[PDB]
């Protein structure tokens, strides 16, 4: 019924601009992966802990590809766009990835 978080971490969410060929900010935010038991669903929701506005609300899908580029930088391709998270700490990155991969395992 409600949204149940399975992890939380600080990161700067960015989108890879294939054209400008650069990595651009989507706008640190708080990143959480929520799960809906009443729908067996998982989402990546990033909120601006400043003005508390949601910057990202992404559904981790069935065939998603999560890549841990660096100890503090991870990305994932949906099938038509790539997202990356510049973490605030290796620790928070380690935490977010275990959840992510775990959520993806369930996703399958």
């Amino acid at each position: 019924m409600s949204e149940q978080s399975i992890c939380q971490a600080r990161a700067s969410v960015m989108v890879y601009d294939d054209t400008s060929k650069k990595w651009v900010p989507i706008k640190f935010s708080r990143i959480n992966i929520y799960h809906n038991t009443a729908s067996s669903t998982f989402r990546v929701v990033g909120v601006k802990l400043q003005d508390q506005q949601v910057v990202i609300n992404y559904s981790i899908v069935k065939g998603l590809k999560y890549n841990q580029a660096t100890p503090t930088f991870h990305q994932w391709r949906d099938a038509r766009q790539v997202y990356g998270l510049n973490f605030a700490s290796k620790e928070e990155a380690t935490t977010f990835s275990n959840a992510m991969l775990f959520a993806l395992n369930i996703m399958n």
């Binding site: 960015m14 890879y16 990595w23 590809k65 890549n67 580029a69 930088f73 990305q75 391709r77 990356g84």
Partner: peptide, 7 residues
């Protein structure tokens, strides 16, 4: 694949 990260 995924591009090279920033830096």
């Amino acid at each position: 694949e995924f591009p090279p990260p920033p830096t």
